[model samples]
Target chain A: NGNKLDFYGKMVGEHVWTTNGDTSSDDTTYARIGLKGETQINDQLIGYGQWEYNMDASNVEGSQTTKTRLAFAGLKAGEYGSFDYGRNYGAIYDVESATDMLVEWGGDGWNYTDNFMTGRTNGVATYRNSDFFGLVDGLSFALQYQGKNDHDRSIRKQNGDGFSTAATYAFDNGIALSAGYANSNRSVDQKRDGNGDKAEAWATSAKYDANNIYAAVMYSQTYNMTPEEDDHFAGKTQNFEAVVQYQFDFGLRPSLGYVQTKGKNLQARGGFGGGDADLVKYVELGTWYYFNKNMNVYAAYKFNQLDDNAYTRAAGVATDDQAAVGIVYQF
Target chain B: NGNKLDFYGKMVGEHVWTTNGDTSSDDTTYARIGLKGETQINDQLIGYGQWEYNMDASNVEGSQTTKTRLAFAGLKAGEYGSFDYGRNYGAIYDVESATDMLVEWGGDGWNYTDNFMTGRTNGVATYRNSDFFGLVDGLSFALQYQGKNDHDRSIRKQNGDGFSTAATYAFDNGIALSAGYANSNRSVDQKRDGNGDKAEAWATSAKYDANNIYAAVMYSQTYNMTPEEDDHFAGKTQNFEAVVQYQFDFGLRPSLGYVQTKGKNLQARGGFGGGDADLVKYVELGTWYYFNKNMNVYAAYKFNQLDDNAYTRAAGVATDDQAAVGIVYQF
Candidate 1:
C-alpha cells in the first residue's frame, strides 16, 4: 500500500570475551545485520517492520538465520489515541529506560535481577490514549491497556490481559521526569493452568541535560502478588540506577554509572527467608568520541558482582564476578 | 559511552488456527516477541548485535518456557564490503527472502523433501558488495557470499557454505526482470560432504499500467555435481512456474498461477525410484479486494496433484485440493 524500500537506521559493532575464573576465556563473536523501515498509509496511520539476520563466525547450524524481529501496523490520530496488535514493549517500563546507563544489563543480565529499559513483551494488543491532563506546557500523561489474551488466553474464561500507565514532563532546560505502573497476569508455568502469580512493577526517573553536563536516575520495583502461595517464587525486586557524564568541546564524552538490584521474599511471614533475596551490582565507565552526527566511537569498562541466596541460580551455576570492555559504531 | 539504550529491532506476531476440521480441531495459539539492534563505531567501520526471546503463555517452566531465537553482531566498511562473524543466514537462502510471498510455502518449497532449512549449521558469515553496478537507468547487478562451519557438529563434519548473485531491472513501462544463481557446497544431504549440489534460477515479469494486467514466468534447477565415480546420486531437479493477473478498477484483483517440477536421476533417468525422477504440478487461482489502502481481503483456490511414483512422500501427503481466505490490514 505505497510502502517503499528506504533504508534507515545505522549498523553497530560489538565484541565480548568474558573470564569467569574457569568457564572458558574463549572469545565468541558474531555479526548482526538489520533493516528497518516505515511507511505512512495516510495522515493518521503508519506501517513498519524490522528484519534481522544472525551471522555466526562459528560453525553451528541454527546459528545464522533470518528472523522477523518486529513487524506491526498501527494508527495514531492526535488527541484521540493509538493502538497496535503484535509483538511490542510495555509502556510502564518507559520510565526506567529513560534513566538506564549500562549496556546489556537488564532482564538477561548475568544477575537476571532487573528488567533493564523497555521490558520487551510480546503478543500485546496495546492501546495508548494521549495526554488529556496537560498540567504544564511540556507536561503530559498517557494510559496504556495491553490485552491479557495477548498471551493467548483470557482471564479465567476471560482474557488474561495486562495494563500500564505513565506520566512525563519536560522542562525548557532539558530536564525530564516520568513515573509509570505495569501489571501482568502471566502464569508460573504452562502446566499450572491458573495465573500462578501476577507481576506488578512501578518506576520513576529523571534526566537532566544541559551545558555539556548530563545526569539521570531511576528506581523501580516488581512485586509477586502470590507471596504466601509460592514461597520461593513470591518476592519483590527493587532496582536503582544513576549516571553522570561530561562532554568535552573536542567531541569526546566520558560517563560513569552504577546499578543495583535487591530482591526480598515477601512470603517469609515468619522472617525465615524474608530478608534480601539477592543483590546484583554493576559499575561502568565509558567514553564516546563523536566523528559526525551519524557516527561515533565508543569504549567502556564494566565491573559486575552478584550475591545470591539459597534459591538463587547463581548459588549453583553462574559466577559472582564479571567484567567487560566493548565498542560500538553507529551509522 | 553516551549510549543509554542499546538499539534493538522490532517485535512481530502471527496466528495459526484450524477452523473447519471436526476431529477435536485443535485451536491452540501462542505469542512471540524479539529484539535486535546494532552499534556503530565509525563511518567506514561499524558493528551489529541482536537478541530474541520466545515465551509461552500457557507454560512458564514447562515445554513453553523461554527460548532464544537469534544473537549476533558484525562489522562493515570500505570497498572490501562487510563481513559478519556470527550466526547468520546462507546467502542463497537469503536471496529467496527477497519477498515474503513464501510465508505459506516455506523455504524454496524444499522443506517437504528434506530438512534443508533446519537450524543446524552454526557459524555462518556473509559478504555483499555495497555498490551495485547499474547496467542502465533501470538495471542493476549485485553479488553475495556466505560461509558456514559446524559449531555443534550435530549434522555432519562437512561444514556448509554457499554463494549467490542476482541481477534485476525495471523499465519505465512497468516491466521488470530478475535472475539469480546460487551454489552450495552441501546442497544435498549426505555425510560424505562431496555429494552436495548447485542451483540456478531466473524470472521475468511485465505489468501494463494502462490495462491493469501483470504476468511473470520463472524457472529454477538444482544439479548433482558428484564425481562420475559416484554412481548412485548424480540426478538433477528442475521447477517452472507462471503467473498472470488483472486488476479491476472496482478494487478486485484476480490472479492465476501454475507450477511444475521434474526430478531426473542421471543413472537410470526414467521414473521415480526406477532410476527416473518424479514430476509434480499445481495450479492456483487467487484474488484480492482492497477495501481501502490500509485494508484488504484475499482468497485462493489451489489445484494440486503429483505424479504417481515411489519417490512421492506418502500418497496423500500432497493434497489435491486446498483453499484459503484471509484479510490483511496494513497501516
Candidate 2:
C-alpha cells in the first residue's frame, strides 16, 4: 500500500559460432540486476528510481569488468506525465526498439557504432506523456535532452549534446505506429576528414499484434555517420528491417527477421575519398521454448550477404554467417 | 518484515565554481545506487549481500563507462558480530566516517590521495562488533584485512595488502571517543622509485552531542610514507581538524569546519627529492535545508590557503576557493 523495494534480474548465456569473428568464447546475451523503488508522495504524485548493472562484466578482461546500465530518479504524476533525470534511455530508442524485440540482432544495423542515435545518455532530462496534449486515446509522446559536461569538454571540444523526440500511437485494432528523430553533434575539435561533424537520424516503425502473432517493420536513415571501412556500410546509410513472430499454445515461439542496409559514398575507417556505394542484407531465424515463467531456451541462425564491391572484395568477405544456442533465467 | 530485498540510493547534483582550476562545472556529491538483500539463515544467524554502482559513470565516454563501488557478501551472528568478504570498506573507514559526515569534504586532509590509509579495498574481509565482548554497554570494535591478487602483481609488481583496526566508546551523556590504526604494505617493485615501500597511520577523535548541537575534533599522524620521495616521512607529517554543526526546528542546518595539514618534506607528483616543509589550511561553511525526509538542498563554500614554500609554489597554488549549490534526493 506504500513504498516498497524490489529486486529483479536476468541472466543469459550463449554459445555462438561466427564465420567472420571469434567463436564460442563465453558470450552473454544480457546479464543484469536491478533495484527499483517507488513511494507515494501525494495523492497525485509518486517518486521512483532505479539502479541497474551488468552482472557478467566482472568476468570480462581489462577495464570492461564493471558497468552501470541505468541510474535515474524521476517523478510521476497521475494522468499528467512523468519526468526523469540522470542516466537514462533516449526518446528515439522507443522507435528502434519496436523491431529490436527479437532474441538477437534484428536491429543491429540501425546504429551499430552508437555515434548517431545512442540508446542512452548521461546528464539527461526526459519527459514522457501517455496522452499527448490530452488529445486522442492511446497516443504517447517522449522528449529527451542530453546536456554537455566539462569532463567531456576537456577531451572533446563540444562533448555529447543532443536531443531526441518520439511519438507512438496505438489503435483499437491491434496496430501501432511510432516515429522518432535524433540529433547528435560532434565536438568542435573533431578532425575535419571530409565526414560531416554531426549526425541526424530519423526512424519510423509500424507493428501489429493479435491472435498470438506479432509483426513489425521499421525504416531508418542517418546522415553524416559512417561504419568501419571493413563493415558493409561505411558511410551515410539507410536501414530497413522487418520481423515476424508467432506464439504457440504450447509455450513455443518462432521468429524470423530481415535487415538491409544501403551505403552512399562508402569509405574505410582511416581511408580518405569516397568509394562506390554498396548494399548488405541479413536474414535471421530463431525459435524459443519456455520451460516456465523463470526459464527459457533458444536457438538462432543468421546469414549475411554483401553486394560485390571493392570494399567487400578488399575486406575478404562477401558472405558471413553465425549460429547460436542460449538460455535465459529470470529472478 | 523478517528478511527482504531493498533498493537504496542517493543522487546529488551540484554546480560548482572553483578558482585556481576548472570553473563552473556540474559535480556530483554522492550519486550511487545499491541492491541489498538479507535472509534469516537460522534462529541466530542471517546472511546478506549488496552490490553498489556509480550511476554517473555510464555517461562518460571511453572506457570509464562502468564501475563497481561495492560488492560484498556477509553473515551476521547474534551477539557474535558480523563478517564480510569481497570488495568492501575497511575498518578504518568506519573510524573516518565518524568525522567525515560533513557534505563534500570534511575528511579531505587525511590521506587525501589514498596513498596512506585507504578507507576501502578490493578482496577484503572484515569483522565488526557492537558489543565488544559484552563487557561494556557502549563499546564497539572493527577489524579488516585486504588480500593480494594476481592482476595487481602482473601490472605493478605488487598487489595492495593491508589491515586496519578501530574501537569506539559512547557514554550515556551523549559523548564519544574513537581511535584507529592502519598499515599498508607496498609491492616488491615499489622500492625501485625511492618512495617508501610501506605506510602506517593512526588517528584519534572525540565528539559531543546534546539537543541539536554537535561538535567534534580529530588528530592524526602518518609515517614511513612520503609522497614521491625515497625518504621515510622525510619530516614527520600531521593533520588536525574540528567541526561544529547545529540543527534548527525550521528544517535548516548549518555547519562550520577547519582542517590543517603540516608536512616537513612534501614532494611533487614524481619528484625524486623532498621539498621544504609546508602548512595548508582549509576552512569550510555550509548550510542544508530539508524539504522532507527524502529531499534536501544545500550550499557550501571552502577556502584553502598554503604557506609559502618550495612545494606549495611548485604545485601552482597559494590560495584556492570553491563554492557550490546542490540538492539531494534519496529513496
Candidate 3:
C-alpha cells in the first residue's frame, strides 16, 4: 500500500508553585496524542491528515477531561505547495511563533486559541507556498480563511469570518524575518456588547537560529481584539515577546523570555474603569534536560510585572511569581 | 527503539429519514479517531494504552459535538491475563454483545454507552483471563469495577460505584455461550428522585458462526436500571435481541435482527404514568457492501413496533419506521 499512518504522543507532568497563584496547578499532568499520515497519490502529489487532542489527568470522571486541539487534512503538490482545511493554526502564528519558544507558557502575549486567527482554532482553510513558488530558498507565504463560529457566552473568544496572511524570508546567515496580519467582522452579539464590530491584528518578528543558539523577538498590536479587565474587550492592545535560548550538546536547553500585553481605551462598565490596563506582563526563565530523544525534565520560573490596579484586580490577573518543574516522555 | 506507535481513524457519513424523526439527522457525518499502542516492558510483561474520540459534523460550530469515548491503560502479563483501568466497556457487555451485530440500529435493545454495566463508559477497572490461566482452551472470564461519577443533572445516567463480571465458553464447532451480572448502589440524587438505592442487571447470550453464517440471541433483565417512558426509572426491565447474518464471498454482509425492551413498575411523576411500558420494540434489516477492507457502503431500515400508548407518548418514543444509508472509510 502507498498509504501510511502513525500515532505519536507526549505524557507530561509538572509540579508548580506560585506566590499569588492559587489558581495555578500544584501538580499538572496530561497526555497529548496525535495522528498524522500520508498517502502517495502520485509521484508529485500526496494527501495527508493530522489530528491531535489533550487529556487532562486531573479532572474527575465525567467532566470534560479531554479537548480536541487540531484536526486538518491537506494536499501536498510538490513544487506547487500545499492546501489544507479544518481546525488549524491561524496565519498569525507564522510571525508570533518566532518568540514563542520556552519551556512552558511563553506564547500568550496577545494570542490564544479560538480567538480569531491567533493559534490553533476552528474552521480554517489555508494555503502555503514554500520557497517562493519553488524559486527562492527559505522563502514562504501563507493565506488563511476562517468562518464565523457562534458561542453565545464566548462572543469575545469565538471567531468571526476572517482572512489572515503571513510571509517570511530567510537570509543565507540563518536569520529570518516574518510579518502577518488578520481582520474579521464581529457578530451581532459582539455589536450588542458595545464592542465595535471589527477585530484586527498585525505583527512582525525576526529570529536567528543556527549552531547552538536561538533568539527571537516579536511585536504586535490589536484593535478591538484583546480581552481587557473585567470581561471587557480592549479598544487597543500592544504586545511584545522576546526569547533567547542555548542548546548544549549534552541535551540541555535553557531559555529566558519576556512577554506583555498592554490595553488602552477600555470601558468602565466592563471593568477597565474607563482607562488603560496592563493585561499581561511577565519575565520567564526556564531550562530543560533531555535524557534522550524521548524523555526530558524541565523547570520554569516566572516573575509577574503588572502593577496592582482596579483593572488587574477586576480581571483577577495573577501578579504571582511562580516556579514549575516538569518531566515529559514522547512516543 | 523499543516503542512503536500507530494512528487509526474512520470517516463516516450517512443520510437518514424517518416518519416521525425530526430529532434524527437528515445528513449525519462524523469522524472517529483512536490511538492504541504497547510498550514491551519485558519478554513476559507489556504495557498498553488506548484513547478515542468522536467528532460530529452535524452540529453548529462551537457546539459540544466532539466526545471522548474511550480511554484506558493496561498491563498484559503473558499467559496469566491482563488488567486495565479507565473509561471502557462494562463487563456485562461480554454477554449482551452476542446479538449486537448489525450494520447499525440493532444494538439498542438493552445496552447504551455510559449506562452502567452496558457499553463503553467511565472509570472502570477490568481484569481478564483467557484459556483458564493457560490450562483450558476456549474459556475466558472478566471482572470489572467502576467508581461513582457525578453529573449534577444526569444522576440516572451517570454511574454509581459498581462491579460486574462475565464468562464465556466456545466450542470447536464455532458455538459460544456467555453470561454476565453487574450490581451498583444508586447515587443520593437518584434515590432522592424516587428510585431505590439498589441497581442491578444480568444477561445471557448464545451465538454460532461457521461457514460465513452467523446467528445469535441475547436476553437480559435489569432492576432500577433502564430509563422508561419519561424521565422515570424502571424498577424492572426485560430485554431481548436476535440477529442473523451471512457474509458472501464477495464483500457483502447482510443482516436481520429484532430488539425489544419492556419496562415494569414505572413511576408516574417521571412519566411512565404508571405500570408497564415498552421502552423499545423494533425490527431492523441492513447490509454492507465492502469495497475493500478499508471502505464500505451500508443501508439499514428499521420498523418501530411499540404501540402508541401513554408511555410512548409521554416519553416521546417514536413508532414510525426509518431508513439510513451510509458510507465509511477507515485507516
Candidate 4:
C-alpha cells in the first residue's frame, strides 16, 4: 500500500444571471475544477496535497485564465494527528463551513476580508487532533498559526501574525456542534486613528442530519476590525445564517436559507454627516433533481434587501436579485 | 461498473535561465498538475473531461496559480467518432505537434495568436474520426469550429467565426504524414486600413521512427494576419522546423532541433523609415535520462540569432540565448 499513490478531483460548471437594481448580464458564472492526491508513506504515516483552479476564466480578457483555488501539502499520522503547511483554510473556517454547504451561494456575510481570521493564509502551519487523546469518541480539534509574510497585499509588513483554533463534537444521533476563534496583530504602519491595529473574530455552528433532512445554523462576529476608510459599513459587524434542506425519494430536493448582517456606527470614516446602525437581509430558495449519484441539475434564486440608513444609501441599492441554473457531474 | 471511479494526473517541475539581449532571470518553475478521467456509459459510448493548473502560482505576485490548461467534455463512440464541446484544441494543432514534441523549447514561431484558428479556442465544437470509414488502417481526421464569442478582446463582436481541419496517416514502416488548414473571419471594427481584416493559416509535417532513431519536419505559414504596429515583423510570416532524436539502451535520450522564421516587407506601420525582409533562426540541443517510466530529468540550451537589418539594428541586438533544466514526474 505504501508504494501506491491515490488521485482524485472534482469539477463544477455553473450558470448564473444576476441583476443589481438596473444592471444585468448573462456574462454569468465561473466554472471550477480541483485536483488532489494522497500517498501512503508507511503503516502509520501519509502524505497529501491538493491544487484547484477556475476553468471559465481562460477566455476572459485582461484576466488570468487560471487562478489558484487551494494549494497545500501535509502529513497525517494514524494514531496521533496531522500537520499541514503552505496555503490552506484557517481554523475559523471549520465553524463557518457548517452553514456554507450550499451548492451555489449563501455564505456571503462571513469571511469577507483577508486581513482578519477568515479565508486562506500563506505561510501557515496547521495541526489537527484525530481523537482528542482518545478521551472521547467523535471529538476533534484544530489549531492554526500564520507567520509574518507579505503574500497578502493588505498585510504588507512583516508583523502580521495571526492565530486560530477550532473544536467540534458529534453525537450518535446525527447531531454535531462546532466553535472557533481567531485573532491577528497588524503592523504599526497599518493602524489609523487607533483603528486596524488589531482584530478578533469568533463563530459557532450546529448541524443536524437525519431521515433525509438536513438543518444548520451559524452565528459569527468580529471586533476591533478596520474597514476601508471609504467603505459604507462599520468596522464591527455581526452575521447570522440558517439553512434547511429535504430530500425526497423521487430524486427531488429543495432547500431554503436566510442570512442577516447587522452593522454598528455605520458611516464613512471621518465623515460628519452619518453614524447610524443598519441591517441587511438575504433570502434564497433552491431545488435540484438527481439523475444518479454522479450527475444532478439544480436551480436557485436569491433576494437581497437593504435598510434606508446612510450605510445602505451609499450602496445605492434597495434590492438585488439573482437567478441561476447549473448541472454538476462528479467522477 | 459505474460504482468504480478512476483518477489520473501528472506533475512537471522545471527551471530555466535566459537572456534576451540584456535581460535575464534564474527563476525556477513550479510544478504543474493535471487531472482527467473517462467513464464508460455503455459498451459503445464513453464520456471524458480534464482540468489542469499550476501548483506554485499562489505565491507568485499578481499571478493566478490555478489556470486552466485544458477543459472539455466529450462523448466517444466505439465505431463512429468522437464529439466534444467547450474550450479545446483546434485541428491545426495536430500538424504543428509533429515537430513541436520536444520537452523544452524549439517550436517558437507558430501558434502565437488566439484570434485565429491555429491555437486553442473557446466556444469550440470538435469532431474527430478515429478511422477513415473503416476502410483504411491508421488513418484519422479532425474538424473544428468556433462560434462567434467575445472571449478574446482582439476578436470582439459577433462576426469572429473560425474553422480548422486536419488529417494524419501512419504507415506500417514507421512513417507518418499530417496536414492541416485553418481560417478566421474578422469583425469590421477590428480591421484597420490596409491592415489585417482576415486570417488564414496552413501547415504540413512528416515524421519517421525506426529502431532507435526518430526525425520530424514541419512547414507552416500565416497569411493576412495583423502584427502589432510596433512589431519589427511583417503581417504575413513563414516558419520551418526540423528535429531529430536518438534513443539509447541505457535510458538516455538525446535530441537536436532547428527553427527558422522569414518575414517579407517587414515595414514599420507609422515610422520615419524601416522596411526589410529578414530571417531569424534558433538552434536547440538537449538530452535527458529516464529513471523509470514515471520520472525523467533533462537539460537544454538554445541559441537564437536575428539577421542584421534595419529592424535588428534599431533593436540593438542580433542574438539572444537561453539555458534550462527540468525534471518531470507523473502518476
Best by DockQ: 2
Q: Considering summed lDDT, which 10 consecutive residues are worst modelled in model 4 chain A?
A: A22-31
Alpha carbon lDDT of residue B320, candidate 2? 62
Output the better candidate (1/3) by DockQ: 1
Report DockQ per prediction, comma-separated: 0.09, 0.21, 0.06, 0.10
Best by lDDT: 3
Per-residue lDDT over B29-139 for candidate 3, one digit per residue giving the tens place of the 0 to 100 score: 556888888899999999999999797643333443677898999999977899999989889999977788877786675687777778898889999998889988998
Error of 1 at B174 (Å): 20
lDDT of 2 by residue, A38-106 (tens): 767678877676666665542446534445656666778866898776656668878877788777677
Better of 2 and 4 by DockQ: 2
TM-score (C-alpha) between model 3 and the true structure:
0.60
| Number of the candidate with higher DockQ, 3 or 4 | 4
| TM-score for each of the candidates | 0.51, 0.76, 0.60, 0.64
| Model 1 error, position A245 (Å) | 2.1
Model 1 residue B290 CA deviation (Å) reads 4.0
Docking category of candidate 3? incorrect
* Model 2 chain A poorest ten-residue lDDT run: A150-159
RMSD of 1: 12.3
Q: Rate the local accuracy (lDDT) of all candidates.
A: 0.49, 0.68, 0.80, 0.68
lDDT of 4 by residue, B241-325 (tens): 9999999999899989988877655556433255544455788888989888888999898877665556665534446688888
